[PDB]
Amino acid sequence: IIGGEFTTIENQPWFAAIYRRHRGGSVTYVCGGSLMSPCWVISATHCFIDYPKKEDYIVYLGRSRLNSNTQGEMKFEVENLILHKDYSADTLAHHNDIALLKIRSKEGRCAQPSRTIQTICLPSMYNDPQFGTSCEITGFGKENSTDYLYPEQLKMTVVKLISHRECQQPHYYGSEVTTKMLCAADPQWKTDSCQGDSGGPLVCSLQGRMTLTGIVSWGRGCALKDKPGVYTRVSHFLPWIRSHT
């Protein structure tokens, strides 16, 4: 997250921190995610498509720092990794960039809701907020495009939703962004998601309820003029999400 503010997981309790074990024992951060139901986390297929082996992945809930065991966190392995069957990656644009990870503790259990661990509600069909609506993002991604390290502490920021026809203008993304994708950015281009934030939540308060409207997917640069963050539009995928869970 470029700019924004440092935060802690009690403000973001549906946020999943996903890591990968490498041959030889080293572990590194991979992508964020969101808890949809006790046994199910949703993220982006691009985070896993090159290493599609469920056994390589560690999922934490209730964790606030990249290298510290926060009081009250739980650790999980992946029972099932489900990648969307029609996913593809163009130059910029990612297509059907959604995935489900069925989670399980070493004792065989799903998550147990607590003060630092909670689900986020999914959207309803044909019901997204209007362009101009403020929404929040969370992640452990880069603070600056020229950094190679990620922040130790969880960050968050707020951005505004942008219409399909504005995001399809020539200096934005043209015909590369489709009706299955949602654009959001800072009007002043000073804050955004960046590398390392992928798969994480775009949450919008809609008719009173906090809703998982988007999933961090792709962008040109970070916090660059006329280049919004692009998000997987969750409401399009309600039939897929339903049948695979």
Ligand SMILES: COc1ccc2ccc(C(=N)N)cc2c1-c1cnn(S(C)(=O)=O)c1
């Ligand atoms: C692998 O990088 C990624 C991966 C996913 C992204 C998702 C959203 C956004 C965004 N701007 N909202 C940027 C992203 C970048 C991304 C775009 N360029 N930069 S950087 C650090 O300048 O190379 C990284």
